[PDB]
């Protein structure tokens, strides 16, 4: 919880969900299962509401995805506010990016989602990791908030 | 012209803040 490895697994779990290529055995964690549901709901909403905007950017490489991600993330969190809903949008956005990359990547490579997962975990750990810890981590913060009633 | 980066960032912040408020303290 809250170290790179844990967050990377969450990010990679979510991209495999979006890409419909789950790892067989032994399945995602409780946290990941709760996250997949809420993040996908947000992703759908965003894809609909920013369609034309998202059509006017070309995600042609992992570097394009990384730079677009980092620039968007910087602007999203520039006011210094962190909350669990904003954390969810990070996962929703990497889902949007991997889908665009699958369509638009000039040299399609199959290990790209692992690269996307990496820089997502890097951002989450370095920019929201202290907040996450202070608010209960994934199991006592995120899951407690978002798990079913 | 329309700033793609800021428009995406602005929307994600709004949706994140909106959803966060939607789920009460539980």
Q: Where are the domains of chain A?
A: 1-149
Resolution in A: 1.8
Tokens at residue A147, please? 């798990």
Does the distance separating the beta carbons of A79 and B8 come in below 8 Å?
Answer: no
Angle between helices A30-49 and A4-18 in degrees, nearest 10 = 60
CB proximity list for A74: less than 8 A, separation 6 or greater: B9
Tokens of A65: 């995805």
The Cα A60–Cα A76 span in angstroms is 23
CB nearest to B16's CB, from A49, A78, A89: A89
Q: How many angstroms separate the CA atoms of B26 and B12, rounded? A: 23
Neighbours of A130 (CB within 10 A): 12
Residues of A in contact with B10 (CB under 8 A): 75-76
Name the residue of chain A whose CA is nearest to B20's CA.
A85
Q: Long-range contact list for A96-101, CB < 8 A, 24+ apart?
A: A96/A43, A96/A46, A96/A47, A96/A54, A97/A59, A97/A65, A97/A68, A97/A69, A98/A15, A98/A18, A98/A19, A98/A65, A99/A18, A100/A54, A100/A57, A100/A58, A100/A59, A100/A65, A101/A59, A101/A61, A101/A62, A101/A65
Tokens 């960032």 identify what position? B9
Burial of A92 (C-beta count, 10 Å sphere; 0-12/13-18/19+): buried
Tokens of A139: 């199991």
Query: For residues A27 and A58, what is the distance between their CA atoms, to the nearest angstrom?
Result: 33
Element (H, E) at A66: helix A62-76
- Rounded Cα–Cα distance for residues A101 and A6 (Å): 24
Q: Which two tokens stand for residue A148?
A: 């079913």
Tell which residue, A141, A138, A148, has the closest CA to residue A11.
Answer: A138
CB B9 within 8 A of CB A75: yes
Q: What count of Cα atoms within 13 Å lies in the side-chain half-sphere of residue A103?
A: 11
Q: Which fold has domain A1-149?
A: Apoptosis Regulator Bcl-x (1.10.437)
């Amino acid at each position: 919880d809250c170290e790179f490895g844990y967050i990377y697994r969450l990010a990679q779990d979510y991209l495999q969900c979006v890409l419909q290529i789950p790892q067989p055995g032994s399945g995602p964690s409780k946290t990941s299962r709760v996250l997949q549901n809420v993040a996908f709901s947000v992703q759908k909403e965003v894809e609909k509401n920013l369609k034309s905007c998202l059509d006017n950017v070309n995600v042609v490489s992992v570097d394009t995805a990384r730079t677009l991600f980092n620039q968007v993330m910087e602007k999203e969190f520039e006011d210094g506010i962190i909350n669990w809903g904003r954390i969810v949008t990070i996962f929703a956005f990497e889902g949007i990016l991997i889908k665009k990359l699958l369509r638009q990547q000039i040299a399609p490579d199959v290990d790209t989602y692992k690269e996307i997962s990496y820089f997502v975990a890097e951002f989450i750990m370095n920019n929201t990791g202290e907040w996450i810890r202070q608010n209960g981590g994934w199991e006592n913060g995120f899951v407690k908030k978002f798990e079913p009633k | 012209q329309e700033d793609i980066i800021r428009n995406i960032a602005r929307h994600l912040a709004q949706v994140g803040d909106s959803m966060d408020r939607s789920i009460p303290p539980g």
